[PDB]
Amino acid sequence: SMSVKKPKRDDSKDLALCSMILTEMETHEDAWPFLLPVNLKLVPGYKKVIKKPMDFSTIREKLSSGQYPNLETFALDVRLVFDNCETFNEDDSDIGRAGHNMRKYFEKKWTDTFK
């Protein structure tokens, strides 16, 4: 509350560390469904169904241009990529499986880097 603060957690490396995680996600072999925005003209249903599209290139551009106020807003966009993927793709599909693998990979890096 006013003039009463918890001790200051060092957040000065967050930007660099999120960038590194994102690099590692970008270069994973199952990243291909997530590298670029879904083409809303060529994928029937996507526009109407997926209210907030998100992809690694869009995250990268937001990260690079100071559009994440903190590391939690960065994690929310990454998770949004996987949550969108689960909404639109059957679990038993190459893309569905890619999404599950990537979410697992992300959450481990996230925990190991920050928790």
mmCIF file of N, CA and C in Angstrom:
data_model
loop_
_atom_site.group_PDB
_atom_site.id
_atom_site.type_symbol
_atom_site.label_atom_id
_atom_site.label_comp_id
_atom_site.label_asym_id
_atom_site.label_seq_id
_atom_site.Cartn_x
_atom_site.Cartn_y
_atom_site.Cartn_z
ATOM 1 N N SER A 1 0.899 -1.206 0.000
ATOM 2 C CA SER A 1 0.000 0.000 0.000
ATOM 3 C C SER A 1 0.919 1.232 0.000
ATOM 4 N N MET A 2 0.331 2.423 0.160
ATOM 5 C CA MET A 2 1.113 3.677 0.193
ATOM 6 C C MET A 2 2.313 3.737 1.125
ATOM 7 N N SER A 3 3.507 3.916 0.522
ATOM 8 C CA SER A 3 4.788 3.938 1.289
ATOM 9 C C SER A 3 5.182 2.578 2.005
ATOM 10 N N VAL A 4 4.614 1.490 1.529
ATOM 11 C CA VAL A 4 4.818 0.135 2.086
ATOM 12 C C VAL A 4 4.975 -0.795 0.917
ATOM 13 N N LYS A 5 6.230 -1.148 0.595
ATOM 14 C CA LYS A 5 6.509 -1.998 -0.582
ATOM 15 C C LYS A 5 7.236 -3.255 -0.268
ATOM 16 N N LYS A 6 6.834 -4.380 -0.878
ATOM 17 C CA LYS A 6 7.674 -5.581 -0.911
ATOM 18 C C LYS A 6 9.033 -5.258 -1.497
ATOM 19 N N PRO A 7 10.067 -6.014 -1.105
ATOM 20 C CA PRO A 7 11.417 -5.864 -1.691
ATOM 21 C C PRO A 7 11.444 -5.946 -3.254
ATOM 22 N N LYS A 8 12.274 -5.089 -3.896
ATOM 23 C CA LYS A 8 12.289 -4.962 -5.383
ATOM 24 C C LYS A 8 12.962 -6.198 -6.061
ATOM 25 N N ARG A 9 12.154 -7.163 -6.531
ATOM 26 C CA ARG A 9 12.602 -8.173 -7.541
ATOM 27 C C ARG A 9 13.325 -7.557 -8.785
ATOM 28 N N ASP A 10 14.495 -8.108 -9.116
ATOM 29 C CA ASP A 10 15.331 -7.524 -10.166
ATOM 30 C C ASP A 10 14.723 -7.954 -11.503
ATOM 31 N N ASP A 11 14.211 -6.991 -12.239
ATOM 32 C CA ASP A 11 13.525 -7.267 -13.503
ATOM 33 C C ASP A 11 14.336 -6.763 -14.703
ATOM 34 N N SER A 12 15.583 -6.346 -14.470
ATOM 35 C CA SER A 12 16.376 -5.618 -15.479
ATOM 36 C C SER A 12 16.871 -6.505 -16.664
ATOM 37 N N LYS A 13 16.971 -7.803 -16.407
ATOM 38 C CA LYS A 13 17.258 -8.850 -17.406
ATOM 39 C C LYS A 13 16.032 -9.543 -18.074
ATOM 40 N N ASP A 14 14.857 -9.151 -17.664
ATOM 41 C CA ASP A 14 13.623 -9.807 -18.201
ATOM 42 C C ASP A 14 13.557 -9.728 -19.733
ATOM 43 N N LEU A 15 13.815 -8.548 -20.285
ATOM 44 C CA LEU A 15 13.725 -8.331 -21.760
ATOM 45 C C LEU A 15 14.642 -9.286 -22.518
ATOM 46 N N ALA A 16 15.896 -9.353 -22.098
ATOM 47 C CA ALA A 16 16.852 -10.241 -22.688
ATOM 48 C C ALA A 16 16.506 -11.685 -22.509
ATOM 49 N N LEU A 17 16.035 -12.039 -21.334
ATOM 50 C CA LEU A 17 15.713 -13.419 -21.087
ATOM 51 C C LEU A 17 14.429 -13.901 -21.911
ATOM 52 N N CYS A 18 13.420 -13.034 -21.982
ATOM 53 C CA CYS A 18 12.234 -13.324 -22.813
ATOM 54 C C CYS A 18 12.634 -13.477 -24.284
ATOM 55 N N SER A 19 13.491 -12.562 -24.766
ATOM 56 C CA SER A 19 14.087 -12.697 -26.119
ATOM 57 C C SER A 19 14.759 -14.045 -26.356
ATOM 58 N N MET A 20 15.526 -14.549 -25.382
ATOM 59 C CA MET A 20 16.153 -15.821 -25.509
ATOM 60 C C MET A 20 15.202 -16.971 -25.545
ATOM 61 N N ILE A 21 14.223 -16.971 -24.648
ATOM 62 C CA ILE A 21 13.191 -17.945 -24.717
ATOM 63 C C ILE A 21 12.491 -17.941 -26.110
ATOM 64 N N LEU A 22 12.203 -16.776 -26.627
ATOM 65 C CA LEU A 22 11.459 -16.637 -27.861
ATOM 66 C C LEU A 22 12.314 -17.195 -28.984
ATOM 67 N N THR A 23 13.642 -16.969 -28.917
ATOM 68 C CA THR A 23 14.585 -17.537 -29.925
ATOM 69 C C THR A 23 14.534 -19.024 -29.941
ATOM 70 N N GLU A 24 14.489 -19.616 -28.766
ATOM 71 C CA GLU A 24 14.470 -21.015 -28.595
ATOM 72 C C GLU A 24 13.136 -21.578 -29.119
ATOM 73 N N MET A 25 12.049 -20.866 -28.880
ATOM 74 C CA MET A 25 10.750 -21.270 -29.456
ATOM 75 C C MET A 25 10.770 -21.161 -31.011
ATOM 76 N N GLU A 26 11.367 -20.090 -31.536
ATOM 77 C CA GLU A 26 11.445 -19.849 -32.983
ATOM 78 C C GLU A 26 12.217 -20.951 -33.747
ATOM 79 N N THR A 27 13.185 -21.562 -33.096
ATOM 80 C CA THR A 27 14.081 -22.498 -33.735
ATOM 81 C C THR A 27 13.693 -23.926 -33.396
ATOM 82 N N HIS A 28 12.698 -24.169 -32.551
ATOM 83 C CA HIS A 28 12.187 -25.532 -32.360
ATOM 84 C C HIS A 28 11.594 -26.097 -33.662
ATOM 85 N N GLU A 29 11.859 -27.372 -33.910
ATOM 86 C CA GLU A 29 11.381 -27.955 -35.179
ATOM 87 C C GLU A 29 9.847 -28.033 -35.314
ATOM 88 N N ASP A 30 9.102 -27.992 -34.227
ATOM 89 C CA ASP A 30 7.650 -27.976 -34.260
ATOM 90 C C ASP A 30 7.029 -26.532 -34.183
ATOM 91 N N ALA A 31 7.819 -25.525 -34.431
ATOM 92 C CA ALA A 31 7.390 -24.146 -34.395
ATOM 93 C C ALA A 31 6.661 -23.717 -35.666
ATOM 94 N N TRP A 32 6.778 -24.509 -36.747
ATOM 95 C CA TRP A 32 6.327 -24.068 -38.083
ATOM 96 C C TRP A 32 4.888 -23.616 -38.151
ATOM 97 N N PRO A 33 3.961 -24.217 -37.357
ATOM 98 C CA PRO A 33 2.599 -23.663 -37.462
ATOM 99 C C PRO A 33 2.410 -22.277 -36.872
ATOM 100 N N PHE A 34 3.425 -21.809 -36.119
ATOM 101 C CA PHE A 34 3.311 -20.642 -35.203
ATOM 102 C C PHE A 34 4.214 -19.493 -35.574
ATOM 103 N N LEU A 35 5.027 -19.635 -36.615
ATOM 104 C CA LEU A 35 6.038 -18.629 -36.962
ATOM 105 C C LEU A 35 5.457 -17.329 -37.485
ATOM 106 N N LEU A 36 4.356 -17.444 -38.228
ATOM 107 C CA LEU A 36 3.740 -16.322 -38.909
ATOM 108 C C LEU A 36 2.299 -16.242 -38.637
ATOM 109 N N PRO A 37 1.705 -15.052 -38.781
ATOM 110 C CA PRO A 37 0.240 -15.022 -38.635
ATOM 111 C C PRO A 37 -0.521 -15.961 -39.567
ATOM 112 N N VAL A 38 -1.599 -16.550 -39.051
ATOM 113 C CA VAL A 38 -2.498 -17.391 -39.852
ATOM 114 C C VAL A 38 -3.104 -16.469 -40.891
ATOM 115 N N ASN A 39 -3.120 -16.926 -42.151
ATOM 116 C CA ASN A 39 -3.631 -16.107 -43.279
ATOM 117 C C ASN A 39 -5.182 -16.140 -43.211
ATOM 118 N N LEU A 40 -5.721 -15.039 -42.758
ATOM 119 C CA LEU A 40 -7.155 -14.936 -42.541
ATOM 120 C C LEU A 40 -8.005 -14.948 -43.796
ATOM 121 N N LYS A 41 -7.392 -14.672 -44.952
ATOM 122 C CA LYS A 41 -8.071 -14.819 -46.250
ATOM 123 C C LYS A 41 -8.102 -16.259 -46.686
ATOM 124 N N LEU A 42 -7.100 -17.065 -46.329
ATOM 125 C CA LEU A 42 -7.003 -18.413 -46.881
ATOM 126 C C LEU A 42 -7.398 -19.510 -45.962
ATOM 127 N N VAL A 43 -7.740 -19.205 -44.702
ATOM 128 C CA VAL A 43 -8.105 -20.256 -43.741
ATOM 129 C C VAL A 43 -9.506 -19.977 -43.262
ATOM 130 N N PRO A 44 -10.468 -20.646 -43.912
ATOM 131 C CA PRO A 44 -11.870 -20.541 -43.520
ATOM 132 C C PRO A 44 -12.085 -20.782 -42.049
ATOM 133 N N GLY A 45 -12.852 -19.917 -41.452
ATOM 134 C CA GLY A 45 -13.275 -20.071 -40.083
ATOM 135 C C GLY A 45 -12.402 -19.291 -39.109
ATOM 136 N N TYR A 46 -11.142 -19.050 -39.493
ATOM 137 C CA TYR A 46 -10.153 -18.557 -38.474
ATOM 138 C C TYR A 46 -10.489 -17.196 -37.927
ATOM 139 N N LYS A 47 -10.842 -16.303 -38.863
ATOM 140 C CA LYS A 47 -11.161 -14.927 -38.504
ATOM 141 C C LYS A 47 -12.303 -14.838 -37.514
ATOM 142 N N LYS A 48 -13.377 -15.550 -37.803
ATOM 143 C CA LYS A 48 -14.545 -15.477 -36.946
ATOM 144 C C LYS A 48 -14.347 -16.181 -35.640
ATOM 145 N N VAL A 49 -13.669 -17.319 -35.705
ATOM 146 C CA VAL A 49 -13.559 -18.106 -34.499
ATOM 147 C C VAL A 49 -12.523 -17.619 -33.487
ATOM 148 N N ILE A 50 -11.382 -17.139 -33.991
ATOM 149 C CA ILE A 50 -10.218 -16.841 -33.116
ATOM 150 C C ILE A 50 -10.166 -15.369 -32.900
ATOM 151 N N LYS A 51 -10.626 -14.968 -31.730
ATOM 152 C CA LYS A 51 -10.869 -13.548 -31.507
ATOM 153 C C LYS A 51 -9.563 -12.723 -31.410
ATOM 154 N N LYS A 52 -8.506 -13.349 -30.893
ATOM 155 C CA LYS A 52 -7.205 -12.692 -30.775
ATOM 156 C C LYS A 52 -6.092 -13.557 -31.346
ATOM 157 N N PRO A 53 -5.854 -13.471 -32.647
ATOM 158 C CA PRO A 53 -4.768 -14.224 -33.281
ATOM 159 C C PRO A 53 -3.425 -13.776 -32.749
ATOM 160 N N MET A 54 -2.505 -14.730 -32.640
ATOM 161 C CA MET A 54 -1.161 -14.434 -32.134
ATOM 162 C C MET A 54 -0.219 -15.470 -32.693
ATOM 163 N N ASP A 55 1.010 -15.043 -32.917
ATOM 164 C CA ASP A 55 2.067 -15.873 -33.555
ATOM 165 C C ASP A 55 3.436 -15.352 -33.089
ATOM 166 N N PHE A 56 4.476 -16.161 -33.263
ATOM 167 C CA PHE A 56 5.802 -15.825 -32.800
ATOM 168 C C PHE A 56 6.360 -14.569 -33.424
ATOM 169 N N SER A 57 6.129 -14.318 -34.731
ATOM 170 C CA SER A 57 6.660 -13.101 -35.371
ATOM 171 C C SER A 57 6.037 -11.802 -34.805
ATOM 172 N N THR A 58 4.772 -11.863 -34.437
ATOM 173 C CA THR A 58 4.013 -10.785 -33.871
ATOM 174 C C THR A 58 4.526 -10.555 -32.449
ATOM 175 N N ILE A 59 4.766 -11.635 -31.721
ATOM 176 C CA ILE A 59 5.369 -11.503 -30.384
ATOM 177 C C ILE A 59 6.742 -10.870 -30.485
ATOM 178 N N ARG A 60 7.540 -11.328 -31.453
ATOM 179 C CA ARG A 60 8.878 -10.801 -31.629
ATOM 180 C C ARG A 60 8.848 -9.289 -31.900
ATOM 181 N N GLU A 61 7.916 -8.843 -32.723
ATOM 182 C CA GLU A 61 7.849 -7.429 -33.088
ATOM 183 C C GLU A 61 7.367 -6.585 -31.871
ATOM 184 N N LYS A 62 6.371 -7.105 -31.130
ATOM 185 C CA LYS A 62 5.931 -6.470 -29.886
ATOM 186 C C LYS A 62 7.124 -6.361 -28.842
ATOM 187 N N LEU A 63 7.889 -7.424 -28.712
ATOM 188 C CA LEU A 63 8.998 -7.480 -27.785
ATOM 189 C C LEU A 63 10.081 -6.425 -28.138
ATOM 190 N N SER A 64 10.447 -6.411 -29.416
ATOM 191 C CA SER A 64 11.412 -5.511 -29.949
ATOM 192 C C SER A 64 11.058 -4.021 -29.914
ATOM 193 N N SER A 65 9.802 -3.663 -29.760
ATOM 194 C CA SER A 65 9.320 -2.315 -29.880
ATOM 195 C C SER A 65 8.688 -1.819 -28.552
ATOM 196 N N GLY A 66 8.986 -2.543 -27.468
ATOM 197 C CA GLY A 66 8.519 -2.140 -26.112
ATOM 198 C C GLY A 66 7.080 -2.146 -25.912
ATOM 199 N N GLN A 67 6.395 -3.109 -26.535
ATOM 200 C CA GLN A 67 4.956 -3.229 -26.301
ATOM 201 C C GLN A 67 4.536 -4.218 -25.179
ATOM 202 N N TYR A 68 5.483 -4.920 -24.598
ATOM 203 C CA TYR A 68 5.197 -5.693 -23.346
ATOM 204 C C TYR A 68 5.603 -4.865 -22.082
ATOM 205 N N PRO A 69 4.619 -4.482 -21.271
ATOM 206 C CA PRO A 69 4.980 -3.733 -20.072
ATOM 207 C C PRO A 69 5.715 -4.594 -19.072
ATOM 208 N N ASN A 70 5.505 -5.918 -19.055
ATOM 209 C CA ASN A 70 6.218 -6.749 -18.111
ATOM 210 C C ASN A 70 6.298 -8.201 -18.615
ATOM 211 N N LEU A 71 7.069 -9.039 -17.926
ATOM 212 C CA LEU A 71 7.217 -10.439 -18.385
ATOM 213 C C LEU A 71 5.870 -11.230 -18.387
ATOM 214 N N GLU A 72 4.890 -10.890 -17.541
ATOM 215 C CA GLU A 72 3.617 -11.600 -17.551
ATOM 216 C C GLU A 72 2.779 -11.345 -18.825
ATOM 217 N N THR A 73 2.859 -10.124 -19.369
ATOM 218 C CA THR A 73 2.128 -9.814 -20.570
ATOM 219 C C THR A 73 2.777 -10.605 -21.720
ATOM 220 N N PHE A 74 4.101 -10.815 -21.684
ATOM 221 C CA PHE A 74 4.799 -11.601 -22.709
ATOM 222 C C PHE A 74 4.285 -13.043 -22.631
ATOM 223 N N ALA A 75 4.230 -13.613 -21.415
ATOM 224 C CA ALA A 75 3.800 -15.036 -21.247
ATOM 225 C C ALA A 75 2.347 -15.227 -21.704
ATOM 226 N N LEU A 76 1.487 -14.223 -21.478
ATOM 227 C CA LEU A 76 0.098 -14.293 -21.900
ATOM 228 C C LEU A 76 -0.025 -14.429 -23.451
ATOM 229 N N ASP A 77 0.750 -13.664 -24.202
ATOM 230 C CA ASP A 77 0.749 -13.789 -25.657
ATOM 231 C C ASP A 77 1.293 -15.123 -26.116
ATOM 232 N N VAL A 78 2.363 -15.641 -25.471
ATOM 233 C CA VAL A 78 2.865 -16.948 -25.872
ATOM 234 C C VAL A 78 1.770 -17.999 -25.649
ATOM 235 N N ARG A 79 1.140 -18.004 -24.443
ATOM 236 C CA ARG A 79 0.111 -18.980 -24.117
ATOM 237 C C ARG A 79 -1.066 -18.808 -25.094
ATOM 238 N N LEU A 80 -1.359 -17.575 -25.510
ATOM 239 C CA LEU A 80 -2.465 -17.312 -26.419
ATOM 240 C C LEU A 80 -2.221 -18.058 -27.737
ATOM 241 N N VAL A 81 -0.962 -18.145 -28.159
ATOM 242 C CA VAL A 81 -0.630 -18.868 -29.406
ATOM 243 C C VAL A 81 -1.121 -20.355 -29.249
ATOM 244 N N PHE A 82 -0.879 -20.932 -28.088
ATOM 245 C CA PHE A 82 -1.235 -22.354 -27.876
ATOM 246 C C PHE A 82 -2.675 -22.662 -27.599
ATOM 247 N N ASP A 83 -3.295 -21.744 -26.904
ATOM 248 C CA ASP A 83 -4.721 -21.728 -26.660
ATOM 249 C C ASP A 83 -5.483 -21.543 -27.927
ATOM 250 N N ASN A 84 -5.049 -20.634 -28.792
ATOM 251 C CA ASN A 84 -5.671 -20.555 -30.173
ATOM 252 C C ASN A 84 -5.514 -21.862 -30.916
ATOM 253 N N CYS A 85 -4.319 -22.441 -30.821
ATOM 254 C CA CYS A 85 -4.045 -23.669 -31.573
ATOM 255 C C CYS A 85 -4.997 -24.809 -31.139
ATOM 256 N N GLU A 86 -5.197 -24.938 -29.829
ATOM 257 C CA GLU A 86 -6.128 -25.935 -29.265
ATOM 258 C C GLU A 86 -7.589 -25.677 -29.617
ATOM 259 N N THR A 87 -7.999 -24.419 -29.653
ATOM 260 C CA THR A 87 -9.336 -24.064 -30.123
ATOM 261 C C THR A 87 -9.627 -24.518 -31.587
ATOM 262 N N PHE A 88 -8.656 -24.429 -32.470
ATOM 263 C CA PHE A 88 -8.882 -24.652 -33.881
ATOM 264 C C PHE A 88 -8.447 -26.002 -34.405
ATOM 265 N N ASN A 89 -7.640 -26.752 -33.654
ATOM 266 C CA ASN A 89 -7.003 -27.947 -34.213
ATOM 267 C C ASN A 89 -7.310 -29.145 -33.317
ATOM 268 N N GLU A 90 -7.524 -30.270 -33.969
ATOM 269 C CA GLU A 90 -7.780 -31.503 -33.242
ATOM 270 C C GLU A 90 -6.421 -31.864 -32.568
ATOM 271 N N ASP A 91 -6.528 -32.317 -31.322
ATOM 272 C CA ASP A 91 -5.379 -32.923 -30.596
ATOM 273 C C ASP A 91 -4.606 -33.961 -31.428
ATOM 274 N N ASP A 92 -5.323 -34.814 -32.146
ATOM 275 C CA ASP A 92 -4.689 -35.821 -32.995
ATOM 276 C C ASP A 92 -4.485 -35.278 -34.439
ATOM 277 N N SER A 93 -3.650 -34.256 -34.566
ATOM 278 C CA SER A 93 -3.278 -33.683 -35.875
ATOM 279 C C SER A 93 -1.868 -33.275 -35.740
ATOM 280 N N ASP A 94 -1.151 -33.047 -36.831
ATOM 281 C CA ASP A 94 0.214 -32.637 -36.677
ATOM 282 C C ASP A 94 0.289 -31.270 -35.939
ATOM 283 N N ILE A 95 -0.591 -30.350 -36.275
ATOM 284 C CA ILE A 95 -0.546 -29.006 -35.706
ATOM 285 C C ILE A 95 -0.954 -29.064 -34.247
ATOM 286 N N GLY A 96 -1.983 -29.869 -33.919
ATOM 287 C CA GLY A 96 -2.490 -30.035 -32.550
ATOM 288 C C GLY A 96 -1.394 -30.543 -31.609
ATOM 289 N N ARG A 97 -0.661 -31.527 -32.082
ATOM 290 C CA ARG A 97 0.456 -32.109 -31.392
ATOM 291 C C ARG A 97 1.628 -31.129 -31.280
ATOM 292 N N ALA A 98 1.868 -30.371 -32.348
ATOM 293 C CA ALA A 98 2.901 -29.327 -32.314
ATOM 294 C C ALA A 98 2.613 -28.337 -31.191
ATOM 295 N N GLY A 99 1.348 -27.949 -31.072
ATOM 296 C CA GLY A 99 0.910 -26.995 -30.054
ATOM 297 C C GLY A 99 1.118 -27.469 -28.656
ATOM 298 N N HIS A 100 0.720 -28.706 -28.409
ATOM 299 C CA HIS A 100 0.982 -29.319 -27.118
ATOM 300 C C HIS A 100 2.454 -29.404 -26.819
ATOM 301 N N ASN A 101 3.311 -29.824 -27.775
ATOM 302 C CA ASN A 101 4.741 -29.929 -27.532
ATOM 303 C C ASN A 101 5.373 -28.552 -27.187
ATOM 304 N N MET A 102 4.973 -27.532 -27.959
ATOM 305 C CA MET A 102 5.529 -26.212 -27.807
ATOM 306 C C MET A 102 5.147 -25.587 -26.472
ATOM 307 N N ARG A 103 3.938 -25.833 -26.043
ATOM 308 C CA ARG A 103 3.433 -25.311 -24.761
ATOM 309 C C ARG A 103 4.257 -25.942 -23.630
ATOM 310 N N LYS A 104 4.388 -27.280 -23.682
ATOM 311 C CA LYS A 104 5.305 -27.955 -22.741
ATOM 312 C C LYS A 104 6.721 -27.386 -22.698
ATOM 313 N N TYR A 105 7.363 -27.229 -23.857
ATOM 314 C CA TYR A 105 8.674 -26.679 -23.985
ATOM 315 C C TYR A 105 8.767 -25.269 -23.398
ATOM 316 N N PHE A 106 7.771 -24.448 -23.710
ATOM 317 C CA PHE A 106 7.725 -23.071 -23.212
ATOM 318 C C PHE A 106 7.633 -23.044 -21.665
ATOM 319 N N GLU A 107 6.748 -23.847 -21.102
ATOM 320 C CA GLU A 107 6.447 -23.741 -19.694
ATOM 321 C C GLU A 107 7.646 -24.177 -18.860
ATOM 322 N N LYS A 108 8.411 -25.142 -19.389
ATOM 323 C CA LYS A 108 9.624 -25.555 -18.714
ATOM 324 C C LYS A 108 10.673 -24.439 -18.729
ATOM 325 N N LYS A 109 10.911 -23.820 -19.890
ATOM 326 C CA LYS A 109 11.862 -22.724 -19.976
ATOM 327 C C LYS A 109 11.449 -21.577 -19.063
ATOM 328 N N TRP A 110 10.145 -21.345 -18.971
ATOM 329 C CA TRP A 110 9.590 -20.235 -18.209
ATOM 330 C C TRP A 110 9.870 -20.442 -16.704
ATOM 331 N N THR A 111 9.486 -21.595 -16.194
ATOM 332 C CA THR A 111 9.765 -22.014 -14.839
ATOM 333 C C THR A 111 11.250 -22.015 -14.512
ATOM 334 N N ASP A 112 12.083 -22.631 -15.360
ATOM 335 C CA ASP A 112 13.515 -22.672 -15.106
ATOM 336 C C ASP A 112 14.166 -21.318 -15.141
ATOM 337 N N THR A 113 13.636 -20.378 -15.930
ATOM 338 C CA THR A 113 14.284 -19.097 -16.075
ATOM 339 C C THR A 113 13.842 -18.128 -14.953
ATOM 340 N N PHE A 114 12.606 -18.219 -14.479
ATOM 341 C CA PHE A 114 11.979 -17.177 -13.668
ATOM 342 C C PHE A 114 11.408 -17.659 -12.309
ATOM 343 N N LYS A 115 11.052 -18.934 -12.136
ATOM 344 C CA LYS A 115 10.528 -19.443 -10.826
ATOM 345 C C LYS A 115 11.601 -20.151 -9.960
#
